[PDB]
């Protein structure tokens, strides 16, 4: 239950494998179960900044992204519900994410380099 994925658009391209570079568009929200779609405050997004690129499965992003994205296919849009332990944990990230925050991300997998 560290990360749960909900598919909102099915993709049919290849699925990322460990070490490949993925290209994603994303928006992140603090989870709040009292709010519509459990989405609390938006804390980050690639929208208007440029698609985000990272090698996947090699701990260069949070564990929920490493595990969620390798389960996706290019073209897929999904929402990842990530527990604090699979996100930024007790530290959080100062200025953006409080300690012990569950997270919701909309993720669109646009490519594998």
């Amino acid at each position: 239950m560290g990360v749960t994925k909900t598919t909102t658009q099915q993709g049919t391209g290849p699925s990322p494998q460990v070490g490949q570079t993925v290209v994603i568009e994303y928006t992140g929200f603090l989870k709040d179960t009292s709010k519509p779609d459990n989405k609390g405050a938006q804390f980050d997004s690639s929208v208007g900044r440029g698609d985000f690129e990272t090698a996947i499965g090699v701990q260069r992003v949070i564990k929920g992204w490493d595990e969620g994205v390798v389960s996706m296919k290019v073209g897929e849009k999904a929402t990842l519900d990530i527990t604090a332990d699979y996100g930024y944990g007790a530290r959080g990230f100062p200025g953006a994410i409080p300690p012990n925050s569950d997270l919701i991300f909309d993720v669109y997998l646009k490519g594998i380099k």
Copy 2:
């Protein structure tokens, strides 16, 4: 070498010990040796918002803050040069801190609880 400190204003109050809670004002920059004082892009600051309060020395914040702040006295202003090992490490934070980034922080210790 994990964190090195330049004191820019001496403090004369008490110094924190491991496990105490500290009150700090800070600004964080990506290290960029092509820029004055090695300060690249500013990614976060408590200036204009409010002070950051945390238990110190117990891995609630990056190692460079744990060691750097413990070395300070209340009233002290210092600049910390923090290696990636002592900062946010291999993940960083998407759109703000790349993986394996050295960091520069201005820190100002304003209280111990």
